[PDB]
Design an enzyme around this catalytic site. Sequence first.
Site, short mmCIF file in Angstrom:
data_model
loop_
_atom_site.label_atom_id
_atom_site.label_comp_id
_atom_site.label_asym_id
_atom_site.label_seq_id
_atom_site.Cartn_x
_atom_site.Cartn_y
_atom_site.Cartn_z
N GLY A 212 4.00 -0.60 10.27
CA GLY A 212 3.66 -0.42 11.69
C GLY A 212 4.29 0.54 11.99
O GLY A 212 3.73 2.09 10.49
N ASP B 71 0.29 -1.16 0.32
CA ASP B 71 0.10 0.26 0.01
C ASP B 71 1.07 1.33 0.16
O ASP B 71 1.96 1.61 -0.06
CB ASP B 71 -1.05 -0.12 1.06
CG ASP B 71 -1.97 1.26 0.94
OD1 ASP B 71 -1.87 2.08 0.58
OD2 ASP B 71 -3.09 1.51 2.26
N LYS C 277 6.64 1.96 1.03
CA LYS C 277 6.96 0.51 2.27
C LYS C 277 7.11 0.04 1.51
O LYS C 277 7.18 -1.26 1.60
CB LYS C 277 5.55 0.40 2.49
CG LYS C 277 4.53 1.66 3.30
CD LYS C 277 3.81 1.44 4.47
CE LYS C 277 2.43 0.81 2.74
NZ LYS C 277 2.98 2.85 2.76
N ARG D 253 -0.34 4.75 1.65
CA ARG D 253 -0.68 5.89 2.31
C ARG D 253 -0.75 6.02 3.46
O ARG D 253 -1.45 4.99 4.41
CB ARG D 253 -1.85 5.30 1.63
CG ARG D 253 -2.99 6.38 2.29
CD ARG D 253 -4.15 6.79 2.24
NE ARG D 253 -5.20 5.70 2.98
CZ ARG D 253 -5.52 5.56 3.97
NH1 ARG D 253 -5.68 6.85 4.81
NH2 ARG D 253 -6.22 4.49 4.51
C1 LIG Z 1 0.88 1.76 8.85
C2 LIG Z 1 -0.39 1.43 9.38
S1 LIG Z 1 -0.88 0.27 10.59
C3 LIG Z 1 -2.06 1.05 11.75
O1 LIG Z 1 -1.44 -0.48 10.06
O2 LIG Z 1 0.26 -0.45 10.86
C4 LIG Z 1 1.49 2.53 8.72
C5 LIG Z 1 2.95 2.28 7.76
C6 LIG Z 1 3.90 3.54 7.07
C7 LIG Z 1 3.15 4.54 7.33
N1 LIG Z 1 4.59 5.73 6.63
C8 LIG Z 1 5.52 4.04 5.79
C9 LIG Z 1 6.58 5.02 5.20
C10 LIG Z 1 7.83 3.75 5.45
C11 LIG Z 1 7.31 2.81 5.65
C12 LIG Z 1 5.96 2.31 6.57
C13 LIG Z 1 5.02 3.90 6.42
N2 LIG Z 1 1.91 3.19 10.03
C14 LIG Z 1 0.98 4.35 10.13
O3 LIG Z 1 -0.02 4.36 10.01
C15 LIG Z 1 1.01 5.27 11.76
C16 LIG Z 1 0.37 4.81 13.06
C17 LIG Z 1 1.05 3.97 14.16
C18 LIG Z 1 0.75 4.36 14.95
C19 LIG Z 1 0.87 2.63 14.42
N3 LIG Z 1 1.48 6.64 11.19
C20 LIG Z 1 2.57 7.71 11.85
O4 LIG Z 1 3.12 6.84 13.20
C21 LIG Z 1 2.33 8.80 11.89
C22 LIG Z 1 3.06 8.95 10.70
C23 LIG Z 1 3.05 10.53 10.30
C24 LIG Z 1 2.90 11.58 11.59
N4 LIG Z 1 2.95 12.99 10.87
C25 LIG Z 1 3.24 12.52 9.79
C26 LIG Z 1 3.97 13.51 8.31
C27 LIG Z 1 4.34 13.12 7.46
C28 LIG Z 1 4.48 11.84 6.37
C29 LIG Z 1 4.10 10.97 8.00
C30 LIG Z 1 3.43 11.93 9.28
N5 LIG Z 1 3.12 9.61 12.88
C31 LIG Z 1 2.91 9.46 14.09
O5 LIG Z 1 2.28 8.04 14.89
C32 LIG Z 1 3.70 10.22 15.53
N6 LIG Z 1 4.43 8.96 16.39
C33 LIG Z 1 3.96 9.02 17.66
C34 LIG Z 1 4.41 8.35 18.00
O6 LIG Z 1 5.82 7.49 17.92
C35 LIG Z 1 6.39 7.52 17.05
C36 LIG Z 1 5.63 9.41 16.38
#
Ligand SMILES: */C(=C\S(C)(=O)=O)[C@H](Cc1c[nH]c2ccccc12)NC(=O)[C@H](CC(C)C)NC(=O)[C@H](Cc1c[nH]c2ccccc12)NC(=O)CN1CCOCC1
Lengths: 199, 219, 186, 187, 217, 219, 189, 215, 219
Positions: free
Chosen positions: C47, C17, C33, C19
């Site tokens: 994660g 994916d 990813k 997003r």
């Molecule tokens: C998978 C979501 S899930 C629920 O299925 O596990 C994604 C995986 C992901 C997203 N982006 C990338 C890049 C490379 C590889 C993998 C990637 N992860 C998420 O959706 C996170 C949700 C966690 C709680 C499971 N989302 C985040 O961590 C946020 C990302 C973010 C926030 N501001 C941004 C600006 C620009 C780009 C990205 C972001 N951030 C946080 O959750 C803040 N955390 C709080 C605690 O941990 C560190 C920072």
Amino acid sequence: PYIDNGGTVIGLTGKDYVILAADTRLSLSYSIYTRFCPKISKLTDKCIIGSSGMQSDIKTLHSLLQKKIQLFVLEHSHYPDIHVIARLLCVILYSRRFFPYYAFNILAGVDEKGVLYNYDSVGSYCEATHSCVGSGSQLILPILDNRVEQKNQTNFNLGDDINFVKDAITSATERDIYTGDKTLIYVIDKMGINVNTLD
Amino acid sequence: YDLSVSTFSPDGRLYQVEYIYKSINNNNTALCLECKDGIICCCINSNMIKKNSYNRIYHVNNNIIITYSGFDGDARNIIDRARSEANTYYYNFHTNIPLHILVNRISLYIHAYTLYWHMRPFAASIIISSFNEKDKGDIYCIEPNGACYKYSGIVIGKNKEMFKTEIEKKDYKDINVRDAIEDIYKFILLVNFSWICKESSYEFQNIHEEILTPALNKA
Amino acid sequence: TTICGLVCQNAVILGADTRATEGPIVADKNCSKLHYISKNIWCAGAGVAGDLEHTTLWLQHNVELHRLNTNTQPRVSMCVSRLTQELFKYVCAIVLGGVDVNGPQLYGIHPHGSSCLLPFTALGSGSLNAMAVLEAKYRDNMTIEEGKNLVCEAICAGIFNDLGSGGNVDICVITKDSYQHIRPYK
Amino acid sequence: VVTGTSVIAIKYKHGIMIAADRKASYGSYAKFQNVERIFKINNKTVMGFSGELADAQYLHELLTRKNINNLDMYTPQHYHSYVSRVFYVRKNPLFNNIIIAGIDLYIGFVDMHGTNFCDDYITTGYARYFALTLLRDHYKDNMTEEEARILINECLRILYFRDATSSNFIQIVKVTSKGVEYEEPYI
Amino acid sequence: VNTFSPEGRLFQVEYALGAIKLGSTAVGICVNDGVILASERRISSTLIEKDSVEKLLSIDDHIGCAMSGLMADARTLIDYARVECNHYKFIYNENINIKSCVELISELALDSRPFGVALLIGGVDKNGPCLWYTEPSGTNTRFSAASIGSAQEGAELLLQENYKKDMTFEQAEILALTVLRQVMEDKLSTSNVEICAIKKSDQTFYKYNTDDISRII
Amino acid sequence: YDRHLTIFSPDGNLYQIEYAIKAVKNTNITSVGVKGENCAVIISQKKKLLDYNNITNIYNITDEIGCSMVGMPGDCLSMVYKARSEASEFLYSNGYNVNAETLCRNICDKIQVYTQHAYMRLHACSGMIIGIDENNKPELFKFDPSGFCAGYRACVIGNKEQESISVLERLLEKRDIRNTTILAIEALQTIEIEVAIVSTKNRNFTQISEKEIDNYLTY
Amino acid sequence: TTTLAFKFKDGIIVAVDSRASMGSFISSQNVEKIIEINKNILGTMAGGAADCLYWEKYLGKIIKIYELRNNEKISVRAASTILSNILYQYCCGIILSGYDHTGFNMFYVDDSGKKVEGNLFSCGSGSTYAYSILDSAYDYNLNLDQAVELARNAIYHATFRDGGSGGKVRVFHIHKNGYDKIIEGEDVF
Amino acid sequence: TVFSPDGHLLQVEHALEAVKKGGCAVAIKSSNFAVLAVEKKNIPKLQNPKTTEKLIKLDEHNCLAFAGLNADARVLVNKTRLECQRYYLNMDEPAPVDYIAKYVAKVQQKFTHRGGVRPFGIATLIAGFEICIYQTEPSGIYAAWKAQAIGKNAKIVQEFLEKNYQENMEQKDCIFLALKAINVEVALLTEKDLTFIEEQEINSMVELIDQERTK
Amino acid sequence: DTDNIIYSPEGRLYQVEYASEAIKQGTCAVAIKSKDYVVVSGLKKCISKLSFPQEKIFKIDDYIGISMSGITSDAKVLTKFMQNECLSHKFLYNENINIESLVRSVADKYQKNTQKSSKRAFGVGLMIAAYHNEPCIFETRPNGSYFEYDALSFGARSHASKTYLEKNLHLFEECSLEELILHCLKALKNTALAVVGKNHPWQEISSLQLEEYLSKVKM
Ligand SMILES: */C(=C\S(C)(=O)=O)[C@H](Cc1c[nH]c2ccccc12)NC(=O)[C@H](CC(C)C)NC(=O)[C@H](Cc1c[nH]c2ccccc12)NC(=O)CN1CCOCC1
């Protein structure tokens, strides 16, 4: 890391002596371990010591202080004054205040008339005319208050005094559950330190 | 050149290591024999002052044996090293140490000090041995600066080369069951004979003094 | 985050994916990813993004550096040991597909560090939604084209079926000889 | 989390009895119906534990590794004092009520806190209520072996029925002038 | 450093002896009523602030310690000795018995470079004044009467000439003033001496007022 | 002085390194390690009451890997224990057994650090290393007390060296286990002995059987 | 407990309750809370007995080595500041009292390590009560007769009004030299 | 380092000499005032070349002068600064010259004592507050003085200074003796405040000493 | 040469050998062993007419006491160590220290000093005299060697005492302590003497009663 036991060790300075009696009985929360335990240890010379906290801390604390008096006397060829003993106790105890010894403690000695040091777990030491500690303290202190002191109303014949000790403790077994029927009683007359297994 | 434990000579010899061979060459003999029914390490210490006792042999377990020659102090310390090793291995592995691995351990221990410029190498060669019916008798001799070697019996100490004529009768030395001692007492022409045999129950033991009598009274 | 990858007749094919999400509002229209640990081995983590960018960086350089230090192509299982050991020291799942002296191996790696070799795998919120369609249609030794269409099918299902998953897809066929990436599978 | 509910020890002039059952319940239910909780540190000394198992084997290996160096020989008293000293060091921990016993005769108990003492008869764990008082009731010095072992057998008899967790059969050891005897037989 | 000489004496520490000979003299005399403690005060340059430099010091309230040899190494050993022999009394009132203060200072003095100084520690602790010379070598010894500095080379005999145990501390003061005035070039005045005392009763350390020594002479 | 320590000459050339190589070159335990076609042999002369049954230079440091060693013996047991440590750390870290050169990075670097660092003496030991690679080609490396991962289709070590390079060349013109092992045992004869191949099980490294020592020697 | 101190004309003075109870129960009424450090300065402990006693003896040490070091008497603000610097690492509040300036300075070091200078500090459980009397009955500098009656008085009302403190009275007027000492039993009349 | 058979230390006796050959400095003392004055030679074109020679102020109520190595002096002085600040922190009151002379002495000694460190190459002298001056030699000794001179040929300056010495004097006139003993690095500690004396201010006096020697 | 970190071409260490060239300056002390008692006399050298002579004897534990004769500082350090160690022992095990465990420990400390280069060997040799059950006399050469003894004399002109030791069995008249002590004062010939055995532990009869005992050699 602390268990309550009732070593009911009491000190009592005579006009030319000091007397230190303690029930021997050990006990868990409500069950007697040994019927006979040494709640009192003899410091190497003209003084002795008692306690009533958890027995591990009693034993290891008496061990440590014995090691210190033996080391001091061997390094200085000189048997310590009672004061350096109690003071050293305040030292050792406060050195561990953040994780305190559970052994509340009593010292009895002679300076050459029983100089004494009863005190709290962290070395807040005090001299006294008399002393009690262990769960049996709160009960006996008034008995000791009146028999010798007459703050609101000759008091240390050896016979009369050992008697006061006796009746005080024997009465203490009755009203208290932790106090045991057996008692050791030490007597530090200037000649030497008697032991009695009166019970 | 000869001034370092570490620096090589122009000819690659290590004179400082080489001197430990002199030390051990002058120091008291400590034969260890092997029977075809056991092992018997022995010592002939040559040190009114007490004469009654000065044992050189000592064990790391009730079965393994040590003996040495050279400076007393260093070797006693290595015996401490071996006790701590056998006991470490017993804490980890819930079994007594094979003699072999212990031998290599002491090889490394003794070897280490040679490499260090400040550090002084130990001055004591060390026999270490064991015998069981299944664990056949072996006598590892450890010359300082490593190279422990298994043996069928080696004499070490001051006069060992003149005893090797006797030990070289190792056919006759293996012939014995419990009388190799009586042969030795004439052969050598304070002392500490011992036992690791079937009669020993394979556990190490000082030889009994009234068993020592037949040897001395044999001639 | 769905991430689905599956072995074909000679090459692993990973798909994932694109997003990112902050939890409520989306915080990215796109992300990566499908990191490229080496030419014939990639990781697809799911994660926290932060932890993922971290350990994938440290992994990529441990593997590229170790490859510089030795002759052998960094065979796929070493990445698995390094990663799992790192996570074991302590929150980010991974799915790594590489091809080597053995077969096209593919691994899945739990947040506690647990490892497993797998015929086909998914992780994240979409995992369930991907296990449904993926398992139903799977067959060992598919033509790689079957990987090409399937992995996109299970991804699209694990997209549409989660609130937490959505956006464009990307897929790659990690042949031992070569990776063959495409930025937007969609 | 294996636990051994009880151990007891008793002495008479010609020797010293010491016994326990071999059960080793792994929580709600038995795992090892044949565990060996009694352990022989010395020809004239043994340790008997009744608490969590792992800690007990830990202290077992410790006391042994501590011994072989000294194997005059290490007295049961020195063994006991080393034991309590170890608990109290650990405390500032290991779950047991290990008792040291052996040989003239010596019995010493140690609570989990390093609390410890010495008495003619010691019971450990659930036995203290369900055996000790009874064994406090009929205990007498210079009991012959028959008197003594029939006595401890009456006590373990009361115990297996009253203790929640006991085994039907008792690993048992008696220390004698001849040397420690670990009787194989169980009941 | 500690390369033993073939002769068997330690090299270093035996080289370090001479440092005390550089010392200006001082004469400590334990007596039945105290410890007297005299030293040269004529060490002074004309323009250093007059009598503003003491050889004699005070490790504790009831200890006073004249020093030989290098002024610096002495200042250090006095520093640590003050620290330790104070730290001894941390809750219990008794100050360290002189023998053991001095035992500390020596047991440290054993083990950089060996100290170039010798001390002459005195005080009353046991029923009776103590007089302990500490050799640089760490050897520690209790004289009844003793002197330090190079002038102690021949001045020591003078003690042997006069030292009876039985003296009023004042008599002892006359004696030590005798022996130490003898080795001085200047006729003794309070600028030639820096005498101190620890009484058998007062037990308090006290440098004499100049008026006093000017009075006795 | 420059000679007394691991430092450069006025001519710019290191000394003590040459001396350690004299330690190896006067150790006088020659050993021929030749690669075989899809196999690889490593042989050494095994050189009283001493046991020939104990003695060897060849030693395995994993199943797939075996390294003959020559030089100061204590250093040899140490470099072997280091080698085993090395393969165990690589396996533990990465899950692959080391390729023989990968073990030579550790062997040669650990052996190197001694060279700069003046204190600990330069390594006094050297020897071949053999093992099946991830590439199916068998891999035979070497090392010198001066750092060297080397690389060979054939090699010799000890008192004899490049003296037997030209001698080895004659086998090199004729260079299966029959065909290759005979080259080795002959290469001892060309200039008992102990032979060691990786190709017993083609990946597992084992010294060839005692009963089968003679048949090549008599063929 | 209950501690009091204030400076009238002739010097700073120190007053205190000797009771030292562990909980509702009374461990002792013989306890002495007043402690001397340097020959001229002194402090009063309040709060825990063991920690306060420890810090006082510790202060005696640090001050003693300083006093040996410079061979002289240190200013009171120094002795305050040392406890201010150590206590801040971690107890029980205290009061200090001494002579360096022509007037005796007074101080008060919190268990927080807060340091305060002023004219009529008081501490302990019953501090508030005498602490009223200290301005209602001492807005300004007075006499020794007036002062010993004052402190004996304010301690008496801190004795009646507070069950946590009582026992014997113990006032200690400080001379420019050292200090004096006085102890009393009950004084209700 | 190590004692010679005489028991004299070599590294120290050698160390002194860098002072025994360095730019002269002196201090003159009295009640609430003292005149510290040194001498440092520099290339005429470069006015800024030694703004560093100038007498150091360790504390507002303290002041120092030195002779010997500058490279070592910057070190010692900074340790002194950090230490006066430490004492002034732990006491909330300023460091007396006594205690700081003691501290600095303990340092210079310490390096002479403990191994691993080359001994100092400098001799210090310190004025502070009543007011009293402490000179500290490389050996680690220190001493009160009424007047003293560190530097190359200190004995001519100083023993000639004895010929002219007089105790308490004038705030300005006490300066003149420093010159009579001693371009010039003049500074005046007074009011427990060190001061960098105006260049022009002494110029009048700078004339008379130039000519009273002539006429 | 000139450091104990290297052996001489003879194979000797000089530095440690220098320790006896230290000990010979020290004053003689002598010891006698009755079957149940041990008696140890010293000789307190007097540096001046006004000096009070130092005491050679100490008292490490109830039944243990010692008599160092070498440079005083090392001696006091060994005492502080042996005392701290006995007290650590009792503090651990509620039990008196084994005498031989102690001797073995202090001797371990000697070797730890005489092996390491940076730390100098001790210039002192203890003559421990005690028992945990049956009376003993140990001597510690300034090295790791230590020997048990029946009777020992050492220091200055101890030579007279040594040759004299042969004239009496250590226990030719053990049965009475007065016989013992008179052998002690003969063997050695204010001056010190001390007694330890059976009921009374260590003891120092330096009383005027000893002054009375002095005439008994001439009485
Ligand atoms: C998978 C979501 S899930 C629920 O299925 O596990 C994604 C995986 C992901 C997203 N982006 C990338 C890049 C490379 C590889 C993998 C990637 N992860 C998420 O959706 C996170 C949700 C966690 C709680 C499971 N989302 C985040 O961590 C946020 C990302 C973010 C926030 N501001 C941004 C600006 C620009 C780009 C990205 C972001 N951030 C946080 O959750 C803040 N955390 C709080 C605690 O941990 C560190 C920072």
